[PDB]
Amino acid sequence: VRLGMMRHLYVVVDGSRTMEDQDLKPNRLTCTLKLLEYFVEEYFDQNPISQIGIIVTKSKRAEKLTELSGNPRKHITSLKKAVDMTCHGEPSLYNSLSIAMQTLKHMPGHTSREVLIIFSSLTTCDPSNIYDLIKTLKAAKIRVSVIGLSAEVRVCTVLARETGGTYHVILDESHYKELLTHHVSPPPASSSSECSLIRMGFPQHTIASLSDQDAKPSFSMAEPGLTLGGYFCPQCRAKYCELPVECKICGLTLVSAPHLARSYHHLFPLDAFQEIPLEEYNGERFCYGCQGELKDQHVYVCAVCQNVFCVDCDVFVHDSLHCCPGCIH
Amino acid sequence: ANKELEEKNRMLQEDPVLFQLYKDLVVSQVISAEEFWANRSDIIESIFRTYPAVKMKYAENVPHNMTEKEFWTRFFQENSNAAIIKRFNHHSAMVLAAGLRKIALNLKKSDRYYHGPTPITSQDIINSFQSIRQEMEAYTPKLTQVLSSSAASSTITALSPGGALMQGQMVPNDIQSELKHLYVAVGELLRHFWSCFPVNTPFLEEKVVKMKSNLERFQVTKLCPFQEKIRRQYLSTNLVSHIEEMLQTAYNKLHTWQSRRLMKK
Amino acid sequence: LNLLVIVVDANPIWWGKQALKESQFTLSKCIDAVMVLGNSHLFMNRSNKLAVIASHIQESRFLYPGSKDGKYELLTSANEVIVEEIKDLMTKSDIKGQHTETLLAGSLAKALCYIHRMNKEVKDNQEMKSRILVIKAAEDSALQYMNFMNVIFAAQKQNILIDACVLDSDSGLLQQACDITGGLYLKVPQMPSLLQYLLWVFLPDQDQRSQLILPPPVHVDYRAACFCHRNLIEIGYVCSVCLSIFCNFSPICTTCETAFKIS
Amino acid sequence: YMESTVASWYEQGILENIQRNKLLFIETQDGAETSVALEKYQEACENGRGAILLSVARGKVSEGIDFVHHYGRAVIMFGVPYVYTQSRILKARLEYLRDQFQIRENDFLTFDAMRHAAQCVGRAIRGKTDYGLMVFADKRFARGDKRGKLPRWIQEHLTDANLNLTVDEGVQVAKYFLRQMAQPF
Amino acid sequence: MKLNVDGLLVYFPYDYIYPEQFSYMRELKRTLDAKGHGVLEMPSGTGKTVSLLALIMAYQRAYPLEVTKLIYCSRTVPEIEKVIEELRKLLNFYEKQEGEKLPFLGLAL
Numbered sequence A: 001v002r003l004g005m006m007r008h009l010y011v012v013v014d015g016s017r018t019m020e021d022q023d024l025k026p027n028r029l030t031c032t033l034k035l036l037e038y039f040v041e042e043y044f045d046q047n048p049i050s051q052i053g054i055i056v057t058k059s060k061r062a063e064k065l066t067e068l069s070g071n072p073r074k075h076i077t078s079l080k081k082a083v084d085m086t087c088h089g090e091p092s093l094y095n096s097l098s099i100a101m102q103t104l105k106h107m108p109g110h111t112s113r114e115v116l117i118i119f120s121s122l123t124t125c126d127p128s129n130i131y132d133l134i135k136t137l138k139a140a141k142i143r144v145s146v147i148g149l150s151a152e153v154r155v156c157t158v159l160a161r162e163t164g165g166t167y168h169v170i171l172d173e174s175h176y177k178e179l180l181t182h183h184v185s186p187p188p189a190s191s192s193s194e195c196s197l198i199r200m201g202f203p204q205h206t207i208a209s210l211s212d213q214d215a216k217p218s219f220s221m222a223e224p225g226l227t228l229g230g231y232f233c234p235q236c237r238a239k240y241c242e243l244p245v246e247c248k249i250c251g252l253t254l255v256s257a258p259h260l261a262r263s264y265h266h267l268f269p270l271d272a273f274q275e276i277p278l279e280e281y282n283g284e285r286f287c288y289g290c291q292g293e294l295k296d297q298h299v300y301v302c303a304v305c306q307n308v309f310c311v312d313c314d315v316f317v318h319d320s321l322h323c324c325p326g327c328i329h
Numbered sequence B: 001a002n003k004e005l006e007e008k009n010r011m012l013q014e015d016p017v018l019f020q021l022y023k024d025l026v027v028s029q030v031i032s033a034e035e036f037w038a039n040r041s042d043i044i045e046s047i048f049r050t051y052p053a054v055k056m057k058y059a060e061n062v063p064h065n066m067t068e069k070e071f072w073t074r075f076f077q078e079n080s081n082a083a084i085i086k087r088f089n090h091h092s093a094m095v096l097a098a099g100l101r102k103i104a105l106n107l108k109k110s111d112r113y114y115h116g117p118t119p120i121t122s123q124d125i126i127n128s129f130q131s132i133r134q135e136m137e138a139y140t141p142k143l144t145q146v147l148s149s150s151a152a153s154s155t156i157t158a159l160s161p162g163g164a165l166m167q168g169q170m171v172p173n174d175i176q177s178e179l180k181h182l183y184v185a186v187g188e189l190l191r192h193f194w195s196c197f198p199v200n201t202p203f204l205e206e207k208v209v210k211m212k213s214n215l216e217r218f219q220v221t222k223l224c225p226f227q228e229k230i231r232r233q234y235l236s237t238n239l240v241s242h243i244e245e246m247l248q249t250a251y252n253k254l255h256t257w258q259s260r261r262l263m264k265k
Numbered sequence C: 001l002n003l004l005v006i007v008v009d010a011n012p013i014w015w016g017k018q019a020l021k022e023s024q025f026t027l028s029k030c031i032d033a034v035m036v037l038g039n040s041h042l043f044m045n046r047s048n049k050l051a052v053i054a055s056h057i058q059e060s061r062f063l064y065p066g067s068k069d070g071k072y073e074l075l076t077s078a079n080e081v082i083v084e085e086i087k088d089l090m091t092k093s094d095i096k097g098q099h100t101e102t103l104l105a106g107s108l109a110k111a112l113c114y115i116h117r118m119n120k121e122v123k124d125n126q127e128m129k130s131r132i133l134v135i136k137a138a139e140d141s142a143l144q145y146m147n148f149m150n151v152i153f154a155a156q157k158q159n160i161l162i163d164a165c166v167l168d169s170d171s172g173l174l175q176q177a178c179d180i181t182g183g184l185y186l187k188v189p190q191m192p193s194l195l196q197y198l199l200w201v202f203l204p205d206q207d208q209r210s211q212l213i214l215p216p217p218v219h220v221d222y223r224a225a226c227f228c229h230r231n232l233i234e235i236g237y238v239c240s241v242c243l244s245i246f247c248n249f250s251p252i253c254t255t256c257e258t259a260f261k262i263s
Numbered sequence D: 001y002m003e004s005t006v007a008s009w010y011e012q013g014i015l016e017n018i019q020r021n022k023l024l025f026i027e028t029q030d031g032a033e034t035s036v037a038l039e040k041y042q043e044a045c046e047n048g049r050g051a052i053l054l055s056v057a058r059g060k061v062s063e064g065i066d067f068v069h070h071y072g073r074a075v076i077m078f079g080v081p082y083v084y085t086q087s088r089i090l091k092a093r094l095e096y097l098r099d100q101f102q103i104r105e106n107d108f109l110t111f112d113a114m115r116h117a118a119q120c121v122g123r124a125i126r127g128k129t130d131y132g133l134m135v136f137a138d139k140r141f142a143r144g145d146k147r148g149k150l151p152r153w154i155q156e157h158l159t160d161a162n163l164n165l166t167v168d169e170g171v172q173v174a175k176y177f178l179r180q181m182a183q184p185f
Numbered sequence E: 001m002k003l004n005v006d007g008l009l010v011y012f013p014y015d016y017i018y019p020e021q022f023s024y025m026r027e028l029k030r031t032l033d034a035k036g037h038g039v040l041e042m043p044s045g046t047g048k049t050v051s052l053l054a055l056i057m058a059y060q061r062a063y064p065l066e067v068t069k070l071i072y073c074s075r076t077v078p079e080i081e082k083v084i085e086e087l088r089k090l091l092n093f094y095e096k097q098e099g100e101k102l103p104f105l106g107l108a109l
Ligand SMILES: [Zn+2]
Pocket: A233, A234, A235, A236, A237, A247, A248, A249, A250, A251, A252
């Protein structure tokens, strides 16, 4: 199944009054922001080439809290600042989606444009009908996958299914974590989706040539002090503090080899290991994965290496490591 | 309409950096400023959009020998019973009308990932295997064999700052702001100069603007070295050469692509 | 507390080459130095715990899950178990000429999941700061890059420090690996003096590493190359499916077979 | 009664808050206004504004209209539907039934109320297994006779635990039930 | 979907039927076999029409002399339009199953 490795995602947060209601254990808005910080960090950790943008909608107006960027810390700071937001007004799906569409219209065709609307207040007061905007969204192939809160909104249901996204409603906080963690992963590319080669640039960390001879002093490029060494660009030739980042001049993505390598496991998903409770002639008391005695009647095995893994080993392998230790051999 | 003049007045003092750089491009009289922009309550409003009757009444009763407080007062002011229901029906209808304006993947070569971009007889294995098998028939020699004082002292001397494996200035402050400002100017103009440079753009109207921008490169880099000269003749310390690399590399790209265009022709 | 894991690269081909050369350094002394390091690590504190793995071309095996000489019972048990198991593993081994490169990614994966198991079992009251003191001894294999990168990223997410201690060779992949997770990278040139390096550079834990002078990190060359002839490239043309660094613009990348549309 | 309740809510601030939360539409005897209001109500339901359609149980709109998925999601019944006890036609119709066929006047009156309520509350389950909740804001329905005369399919789903929920408890359980129905099969 | 009803075999266009549909069909067949007027209630606004129409058509095929024709009445014309749509779908399904046209006529006044 074709997957879009590079995706520009907009997490549309609503500053509606209904967010005031403390349906969850803490305030709803505070919980959403606290978990969305984790979502942002994990999304960047699972898709370095991708970038994210936050639009906060309240009082019938949508404001770009943070433009598209490759730095998780800046977005995290924006979330922490927004934690104290007043949270009064009414959202406008038309306004939020129009802002997202305006920013995403000029984005490259190859990248997957995606929107995740964390809908809280079921109402949607908009200057213009949103069914018309749905046509433009379908034309622009911008995937929109709403996540409703305490409501199965019909307009958002049709939005999601027509635009190709998925609709969900929060059963509880634990299920909210699961929903956002699921949305972290790249979505499969459908027929409407198209792939195209994208120019990429690989910089190399550089320092003073020899005892600060013919040095290359520079401060930064988006109170930066002088830097003896740092990253550079093949074309900008402008010092960059951290990678990966889009060029401020070229418009070309600067990214190192490990960042790309971080996404190969998506192309190579791990086949689920059959769960057999009984020992099944497994005379090895120690679990091969962790070399620990199997204290539970559960075993996992591959179709190639035919090794033995306990519950923790299998869960960790399929969750984070994304590869079978013994089966690597 | 003087929309450009209105926008310039709006951004004249609201945003300092934008106007600072736009003015800087003219301070030394580099180029014309045309290309700069060429290339790049609630209740009353709600009533205004809600009640067309109120809109007509406002148009006809625009303040004339009256007061806005009086106009506000005029707002709130079975026959009455049905009027309320009719009024809600009409008002909700008006609000709604105002809101209603008129692929499975397959691959042939997977080992390329197994050996990614990272770069790079028979009896020898047998000999090594047997020798290492016979190596460790004796164990636990830690008492003296593992380490010796002379080697330990050599290791400590190496770990010393002058030793092996251990190799071992913010004096200017005001110059920092000037360097930052110059870098911002370079970035601003390089943005437009590189906006369409990577793309071939084999069209007459597309190439005209790259030619104009290429000339603008000469014209801006004409004035950059004069400020460089002013800064240089202070102490001849802490050389600023990174700025030179950007200009020289832009010139190299310009000339190389000009030669390539001539070759293509 | 701290959970240390020593991933020793005991490659029979290379260590037996040393044995044939009759050099001063030997695998026996390397194992003794690693043993002393582990003993000192546990010596540091009771709560501290350690484990050992041996890396071989075929597979990797754990070397670790009275006072006859007046010795501490726990460290005596550690000495006996590691000595016996390492001798058994080295003595018994099949021969396969096709596969001779040392295996390290699988050993590191085993270490990572072992650390996860210990972190799950340990009480939540005490926080565990695990570490992996990888000790390479032979050149790495090109085909292992992908899996090794997977395990390195897993370690980064799980907050484990990969302290590399390569000797006799500088593995660019391993230095890249430890750089990502912030682990130290020391290249000891004096093998008979390896243990002094451990008791200074590696032995101190992450808690005290910041407040201590240690050798500066080595510059890491994050090179990129096209999949054709294997050479450094500064500009890569990747697609949206393969995510592969290529040579030059082509109508369709071979590893994709996609119907790229020109423009 | 609908007009009196609407007027009281208008005098108080409840009605304005309801208007803010969601659009409000009302029914009138005139068929033209009824049709226009319902036409706008459908568009409101399609859009995210939503709508609250106040109507009368005996109104021709109630019988003619059919509510489906994302239409009339939550059916609210304000008061047991009873015809005025002054219309003399029903007096003949009712006392004659008492005299012949032996039906108690109260029995037939409660039957006429329960049948009408079931008619006007049974629309949300039209078809295609579209979720929806029917809330009856009247303690009279909690009486055994009303429950017994209620249709079997609704009554069996109804339970004693939720029989006489307070307003707040009913709101909470409605929210939870909507959560459960939101997720797919 | 051919259902082996107790009385006979009855065709059905949709894939699956709930147990309440089985109960409805069996009770309706009992009433028709008794050839006596009766009353019954089914919750669903839709689905009852298709089940009733299918059972009546199958009973007509089995005992054409027993029932001359079906007179199905609905409250309003907009509603009876949906009924005629359901009947058209059922007839198309049955015609596809049989492979040919049969002397069956259905209309709305
Ligand atoms: Zn650049």
